[PDB]
């Protein structure tokens, strides 16, 4: 019977919408959450009400043996994995390491490493059932806290370089690797949103479903020949420095 | 009633499949051909047998006033253009300029210029009906002849740079610009194909429909937030130098 | 004598670039954001090298003040031959309210500042047959200080703006390149009480012999502005000992 | 004395790079594909500079012969400090039959050759504490000659292979960069009966003062291998006066 999809950081936000969409396409879903059993089980229930089996597993970026154990559970629950959505667009916070204080590159390095570690672990299981697909997604939401707590997101360059690297490592195992970078958009909640609305060309505010569509495309059998590509989905917001200058 | 799509180089190969797919999605189609009225009108007839109106117009890369005239015809036939498939993956040949003999960059320069000239002309018409979409496609098929006759294709770098440039110029007119580069694959016909088959990982030979899918994705309303992106569709063939080395 | 402007040049990489260019025989414009004395000290050290020097105050997000500084260079030296467009200074700027929502907005404001300065410089350089612009950038110390952020730009944004400038300005005989060389992560240039414990942490995580220093970013800037580099256009060089891809090397 | 290998060095850019490195005090290995005499003449000119020289014959698509050349360098000089991995020589190679089907296959064979040489060089450099590798490339004269093609690689392929090498070899103290500088389009280096009419055509289509020459690619190679560039890793520099984006400048 059904194919299996793991989505990390999927008790809410983009992870949830991605796991929902995939449940609607008939995958059995693995929901992964870092603290917040509540949202996670709510989300599992929703999923379950479409037919489709669900498994809920807890683990966060800073937990290597818990991550391996999570894949060991997937194997014992479903015995296969087809689609892995390696989500660093979740806005989940992780403690700042002293290192990172010295340079932004160290954050990117730690976060790219986490993306790579997860994708490789996933690959050991996928290659039992003849491979499958990995799509890494990422957004650099905010910097609310820095007292510990920074993003798990990577920049587009690090994402590009990491996903080019994975496609060459994993194409020989029948794992199709791509990525999507962008990310949609505390107090003043409304005021920060109106600030962001007036600074964006009309009609060009990215939403969660926009990132979800692309992942869905990449994971359908209409994209099996796209390898190691990183697609920016953001309505052009990362190059707005050029539109305004070029007029 | 219907939306309108122009596909250049569409009397055969990838152009044809792209114009077919779009006819199946309910666009009125403009077929453009360079010499070979036969294939073109055959192709128009096929199109017409799906409902959907067709217009056949002749013009080639080396003909500026004929190209403008072609858009002046579209305007007088349909009075609007929504989707433009700026096709440099057609394998149509153009005469070599003496310039090009001196360096590959001059070929790329001439061909990128042609892509840009067409896209800008198209943009003047599209902006009458509130914009639309442009997808530039390209492949560097062979070098059969060089006695005149070279490709109209561009490299991925020139395609990237040209499509980044167009998205910033045209996003302010509601024209969504992206690109796809790759291209599927005379005597020994069979032997060159078996050579290409044994040198490609099994299951990873790109076909025309693979480029057609991506264009179709980019042109659906599921991609309106993808701007100025160039997607490589080739099963990883352009980075096979790395798979073989990295083992 | 030729003339060189270097923004954020009272301290750090901009200081060291102004010294190297003064050593090559340019008159120098020192731009400072914050402390007069540092800028006055640097001005005096470069004067000891036998070039004239001009100190002007201006910070990003002061477009009127920026415009006047270039009017001052024209008033004082009447020319501009090299512009080191410095976003690698570690200077902090006030956070704009939108930019709380997404990293992209910070990158957009920072890139727009580099663009605007280079364009202002270019109007001036027109009058003496053009020159060289090099934008340099580091995303160093995104430490903490609610309401303060980096003026730095990321590689991708630096690359795209440098491509753009070179295409816009080569026709005006202005050679445009950039150094992202993520910049100097070493360096007592970093005001953390633990200053020392952090350097040794940076040192213990980076392969031996591979810690970039200010002088490496400066050596590239100097090569880009020497006669030996005139056919390089619109390039962005990362100078960081591979730090930004250490992840791939760990992986292998 | 240190030692430098430059492939395709009998003529053109490889010749000029061997001369510059001999002028900096390296012993030189001249590799030639085709003509003994050119290589013998170049060897004699570099000898006049007071360094020792070794001439070895080898062409791409001869992997056994390539391996032996590095064994010869070890036999003659016992070390290797700088490898100029030259795909900008304009040397032609026999077309493989698959590569008729798509440009990508030519780029794959050309990139694989650069990779294989640099890896062979690296085994040797291990024994003297590593060194510098710079790959250079030009897609010049893709003229005509049924059954013959360029050994050159495109920017994107050069960039991806250089990224790869730097990640693989930095851990071995081998600094890897590349110059694509699309190379020299000028140049009596180009054997067309109309030689002259073609240069003036190249000249009339490129902005004034913006025609790259061999010495510009050589100046970058020399900067990349000097002490001043050790923190630059895995970078690919285009040196072409903007030629590869002239399309954007026309457009504007």
SS3 D48: coil
Handedness of CA B125, B129, B130, B134 (dihedral sign): negative
Task: Report the alpha-carbon distance of residue D189 to residue D175 in Å, rounded.
Answer: 30
- Are D118 and D85 a contacting pair, CB within 8 Å? yes
Closest CB to B231 among A201, A231, A236: A231
SS3 D133: strand
Q: What Å distances lie between residue B101 and B98, C158, D91, D144, CA to CA? A: 6, 34, 16, 9
> Does the distance separating the beta carbons of D144 and B191 come in below 8 Å?
no
Whether chain B has a CB inside 8 Å of the CB on A171: the answer is yes
Sequence-separated (6 or more) residues with CB below 8 Å from residue A205: A184, A185, A196, A197, A235
Structure tokens at D31: 């590799």
DSSP string, C107-164: HHHHHHHHHHHHHHHHHHHHTTT-EEEEEEE--B-----TTEEE----HHHHHHHHHH
Query: How close D77 gets to chain B, by Cα (Å)?
Result: 29
Determine the residue among C231, C236, C239, C245 to mutate to test chain D binding: the one whose Cβ has the most chain D Cβ atoms within 10 Å: C231
Task: Report the alpha-carbon distance of residue B212 to residue B10 in Å, rounded.
Answer: 12
Query: How close D209 gets to chain B, by Cα (Å)?
Result: 18
- Are A135 and A231 a contacting pair, CB within 8 Å? no
Task: Report the alpha-carbon distance of residue B198 to residue B196 in Å, rounded.
Answer: 6
Binding residues of D for NADP(+): 10-13, 33-35, 59-60, 86, 155, 184-186
Pairing of strands B28-33, C148-150: unpaired
Main-chain dihedrals φ then ψ at residue B9, nearest 5 degrees: 60, 40
Task: Report the alpha-carbon distance of residue C31 to residue C38 in Å, rounded.
Answer: 11
Closest CB to C103 among A98, A99, A140: A140
CATH hierarchy code of domain C1-252? 3.40.50.720
SS3 C195: helix
Can you give the C-alpha Rg of chain A in angstroms? 18
Which chains does chain D touch, 3 or more C-beta pairs < 8 A?
Answer: B, C
Phi-psi region of D196 (alpha: psi -120 to 50; beta: other; left: phi over 0): alpha
Chain A residues whose beta carbon lies within 8 Å of the beta carbon of residue C100: 142, 192
Can you tell me which residue has the tokens 């916070």?
A: A93
**Searching chain A, which residue's CA lies closest to the CA of residue C118?**
A245
Query: How close A201 gets to chain B, by Cα (Å)?
Result: 8
Query: How close B168 gets to chain A, by Cα (Å)?
Result: 5
**Searching chain C, which residue's CA lies closest to the CA of residue D169?**
C249
For residue B145, the tally of other CB atoms under 10 A from its CB is: 12
DSSP string, D5-19: EETT-SSHHHHHHHH
- Are C27 and C104 a contacting pair, CB within 8 Å? no
SS3 C241: coil
- Are A23 and A2 a contacting pair, CB within 8 Å? no
Task: Report the alpha-carbon distance of residue B19 to residue B54 in Å, rounded.
Answer: 10
Whether chain A has a CB inside 8 Å of the CB on C167: the answer is no
What ranges in D7-135 are assigned the alpha helix state H? 12-23, 36-47, 63-76, 103-126
Can you tell me which residue has the tokens 């990491």?
A: A162
For residue D227, the tally of other CB atoms under 10 A from its CB is: 6
Q: Which of B113, C120, B185 is nearest to D103 (CA)?
A: B185
D155 is catalytic: yes
Whether chain D has a CB inside 8 Å of the CB on C237: the answer is yes
Chain D residues whose beta carbon lies within 8 Å of the beta carbon of residue B142: 100-103
Query: How close A21 gets to chain B, by Cα (Å)?
Result: 14
> Does the distance separating the beta carbons of B243 and A172 come in below 8 Å?
yes
Q: What Å distances lie between residue B39 and A59, B9, B13, B107, B211, CA to CA? A: 59, 11, 11, 28, 21
Say which DSSP state D238 is in: -
Q: Is C78 exposed, middle or buried (0-12, 13-18, 19+ CB in 10 A)?
A: exposed
Task: Report the alpha-carbon distance of residue A88 to residue A65 in Å, rounded.
Answer: 19
Task: Report the alpha-carbon distance of residue C174 to residue C122 in Å, rounded.
Answer: 7
Task: Report the alpha-carbon distance of residue C68 to residue C75 in Å, rounded.
Answer: 10
Query: How close D96 gets to chain C, by Cα (Å)?
Result: 32
Cα angle D166, C137, A247 (rounded to 5 degrees) comes to 115
SS3 C87: strand
Sequence-separated (6 or more) residues with CB below 8 Å from residue B103: D138, D139, D140, D141, D182, D183, D185, D202, D243
Task: Report the alpha-carbon distance of residue B150 to residue B144 in Å, rounded.
Answer: 8
- Are A123 and A170 a contacting pair, CB within 8 Å? yes
D-proximal residues of B, 85-104, CB under 8 Å = 98-99, 101-104
Say which DSSP state D96 is in: P
Sequence-separated (6 or more) residues with CB below 8 Å from residue B118: B8, B67, B84, B86
> Does the distance separating the beta carbons of D245 and C163 come in below 8 Å?
yes
Q: Which of D155, D236, D26, D25 is nearest to D6 (CA)?
A: D26
Q: Is A36 exposed, middle or buried (0-12, 13-18, 19+ CB in 10 A)?
A: middle
Q: Binding site annotation covers A131?
A: no
> Does the distance separating the beta carbons of D233 and C237 come in below 8 Å?
no
**Searching chain B, which residue's CA lies closest to the CA of residue D252?**
B165
Produce one character per residue of A57-70: b if its CB has 16 or more CB atoms within 10 Å, e if not. bbbbbeeeeebeeb
Give the CA dihedral A220, A221, A226, A229, nearest 10 degrees.
20
Task: Report the alpha-carbon distance of residue D84 to residue D222 in Å, rounded.
Answer: 10
**Edge to edge, what strands does the sheet with A83-88 contain?**
A54-58, A28-33, A4-7, A83-88, A132-139, A175-182, A230-233
Q: Which of C148, C142, C158 is nearest to C110 (CA)?
A: C158
Cα angle D234, D236, D237 (rounded to 5 degrees) comes to 140
Task: Report the alpha-carbon distance of residue B83 to residue B134 in Å, rounded.
Answer: 6
Chain A residues whose beta carbon lies within 8 Å of the beta carbon of residue C155: 155, 157
B-proximal residues of D, 173-212, CB under 8 Å = 182-183, 185, 190, 192, 194, 197-199, 201-202, 205
Determine the residue among D170, D231, D234 to mutate to test chain C binding: the one whose Cβ has the most chain C Cβ atoms within 10 Å: D231
Chain A residues whose beta carbon lies within 8 Å of the beta carbon of residue C247: 108-109, 112-113, 116, 158, 161-162
Phi-psi region of C154 (alpha: psi -120 to 50; beta: other; left: phi over 0): beta
Sequence-separated contacts (24+) of B183-188 with Cβ below 8 Å: B183/B14, B183/B89, B183/B138, B183/B139, B183/B140, B183/B141, B183/B153, B183/B211, B183/B234, B183/D102, B184/B14, B184/B139, B184/B208, B184/B210, B184/B211, B185/D101, B185/D102, B186/B144, B188/D97
Sequence-separated (6 or more) residues with CB below 8 Å from residue A221: none
Spot the catalytic one: A38, A66, A149, A222. A149
Handedness of CA C206, C207, C208, C212 (dihedral sign): negative
**Searching chain D, which residue's CA lies closest to the CA of residue C166?**
D242
Say which DSSP state C95 is in: P
Cα angle C129, C132, C137 (rounded to 5 degrees) comes to 155
Chain A residues whose beta carbon lies within 8 Å of the beta carbon of residue B223: 213-214, 217
Main-chain dihedrals φ then ψ at residue B158, nearest 5 degrees: -65, -40
- Are B40 and B93 a contacting pair, CB within 8 Å? no
SS3 D38: helix
- Are A233 and A241 a contacting pair, CB within 8 Å? no
Structure tokens at B126: 């599209």
Structure tokens at A181: 């970078």
- Are D125 and D80 a contacting pair, CB within 8 Å? yes
Main-chain dihedrals φ then ψ at residue C178, nearest 5 degrees: -150, 155
Whether chain D has a CB inside 8 Å of the CB on C238: the answer is yes
Can you give the C-alpha Rg of chain C in angstroms? 18
Q: Which of A216, A235, A176, A213 is nearest to A25 (CA)?
A: A216
Task: Report the alpha-carbon distance of residue A106 to residue A99 in Å, rounded.
Answer: 7
C-proximal residues of A, 101-130, CB under 8 Å = 101-106, 108-109, 112-113, 116
Q: Binding site annotation covers B138?
A: no
Spot the catalytic one: D52, D67, D155, D164. D155
Whether chain C has a CB inside 8 Å of the CB on D166: the answer is yes
For the packed helices C103-126 and C63-76, what is the interaxial angle rounded to 10 degrees?
Answer: 30
Main-chain dihedrals φ then ψ at residue B190, nearest 5 degrees: -70, -35
- Are D60 and D36 a contacting pair, CB within 8 Å? no
DSSP string, C54-86: EEEE--TT-HHHHHHHHHHHHHHTS---EEEEE
Give the 3-state DSSP-derived string for chain B, with helices as H, strands as E and coil as C: CCCEEEECCCCCHHHHHHHHHHHCCCCEEEEEECCCHHHHHHHHHHHHECECCEEEEECCCCCHHHHHHHHHHHHHHCCCCCEEEEEECCCCCECCCHHHHCEHHHHHHHHHHHHHHHHHHHHHHHHHHCCEEEEEEEECCCCCCCCCCECCCCCHHHHHHHHHHHHHHHHHHCEEEEEEEECCCCCCHHHHHHHHHHCCCCCCCCCHHHHHHHHHHHHCCCCCCCCCCEEEECCCHHHHHHHHHHC
Q: What Å distances lie between residue D119 and B246, C176, D162, CA to CA? A: 12, 34, 12
DSSP string, A175-227: EEEEEEEE----TTHHHHHHHHHHTS-TT----HHHHHHHHHHHHSTT-TT--
Q: Please, what CATH class does the domain formed by B1-247 belong to?
A: alpha beta
- Are B228 and B177 a contacting pair, CB within 8 Å? yes
Query: How close B140 gets to chain D, by Cα (Å)?
Result: 6
Which residues in chain C are immediately followed by a break of C to N over 2.5 Å? Answer: none
Cα angle D112, D118, D123 (rounded to 5 degrees) comes to 125
DSSP string, D146-198: TTEEE----HHHHHHHHHHHHHHHGGGTEEEEEE-----SSSS-S--TTHHHH
Can you tell me which residue has the tokens 């910033």?
A: B168
Chain C residues whose beta carbon lies within 8 Å of the beta carbon of residue D228: 219-220, 223
Task: Report the alpha-carbon distance of residue D22 to residue D38 in Å, rounded.
Answer: 17
Task: Report the alpha-carbon distance of residue C101 to residue C31 in Å, rounded.
Answer: 31
D217: Cα within 13 Å, side-chain hemisphere: 33
Chain C residues whose beta carbon lies within 8 Å of the beta carbon of residue A241: 107-108, 111-112, 115, 157, 160-161
Closest CB to B112 among D119, D155, D247: D247
D154: Cα within 13 Å, side-chain hemisphere: 22
A149 is catalytic: yes
Sequence-separated contacts (24+) of D118-122 with Cβ below 8 Å: D118/D83, D118/D85, D118/D165, D118/D169, D118/D176, D119/B245, D120/D66, D120/D67, D120/D70, D121/D5, D121/D70, D121/D80, D121/D83, D121/D85, D122/D169, D122/D172, D122/D174
Task: Report the alpha-carbon distance of residue D202 to residue D199 in Å, rounded.
Answer: 5
Task: Report the alpha-carbon distance of residue A40 to residue A94 in Å, rounded.
Answer: 19
Binding residues of D: 10-13, 33-35, 59-60, 86, 155, 184-186
Sequence-separated (6 or more) residues with CB below 8 Å from residue A59: A32, A34, A66, A67, A69, A70
Strand partners, A181: A138, A232
- Are D238 and D182 a contacting pair, CB within 8 Å? yes
Produce one character per residue of C113-124: b if its CB has 16 or more CB atoms within 10 Å, e if not. bbbebbebbbeb
CA A96 from chain centre, in angstroms, equals 20
Task: Report the alpha-carbon distance of residue A156 to residue C155 in Å, rounded.
Answer: 10
- Are D15 and D89 a contacting pair, CB within 8 Å? no
Q: What Å distances lie between residue D102 and B102, B211, D91, CA to CA? A: 21, 16, 21
Q: Binding site annotation covers B14?
A: yes
Closest CB to A232 among B171, B229, B236: B229
Task: Report the alpha-carbon distance of residue B139 to residue B148 in Å, rounded.
Answer: 18
* Resolution of the coordinates, Å: 2.2
For residue D214, the tally of other CB atoms under 10 A from its CB is: 20
- Are A44 and A31 a contacting pair, CB within 8 Å? yes
Strand partners, C31: C56
Identify the H or E element spanning D251: helix D246-251
Produce one character per residue of C125-153: b if its CB has 16 or more CB atoms within 10 Å, e if not. beebebbbbbbbbbbbbbbeeeeebbbbb
């Amino acid at each position: 019977q059904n194919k299996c999809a793991l989505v990390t950081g999927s008790s809410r936000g983009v992870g949830k919408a991605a796991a929902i969409r995939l449940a609607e396409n008939g995958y059995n879903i693995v929901i992964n959450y870092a603290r917040s059993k509540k949202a996670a089980l709510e989300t599992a229930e929703e999923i379950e009400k479409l037919g489709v089996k669900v498994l809920v597993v807890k683990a966060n970026v800073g937990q290597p043996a818990k991550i391996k154990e999570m894949f060991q559970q997937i194997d014992e629950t479903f015995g296969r994995l087809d689609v892995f959505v390696n989500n660093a667009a979740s806005g989940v916070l992780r403690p700042v390491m002293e290192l990172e204080e010295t340079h932004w590159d160290w954050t990117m390095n730690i976060n790219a490493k986490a993306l790579l570690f997860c994708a490789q672990e996933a690959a050991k299981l996928m290659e039992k059932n003849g491979g499958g697909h990995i799509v890494s997604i990422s957004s650099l939401g905010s910097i609310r806290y820095l007292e510990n707590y920074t993003t798990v997101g990577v920049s587009k360059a690090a994402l590009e370089a990491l996903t080019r690297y994975l496609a060459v490592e994993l194409s020989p195992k029948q794992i199709i690797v791509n990525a999507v970078s962008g990310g949609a958009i505390f107090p003043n909640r409304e005021d920060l949103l109106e600030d962001a609305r007036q600074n964006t060309p009309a009609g060009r505010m990215v939403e969660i479903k926009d990132m979800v569509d692309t992942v869905e495309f990449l994971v359908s059998s209409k994209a099996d020949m796209i390898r190691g590509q990183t697609i920016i989905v953001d309505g052009g917001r990362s190059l707005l420095v050029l539109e305004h200058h070029h007029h």
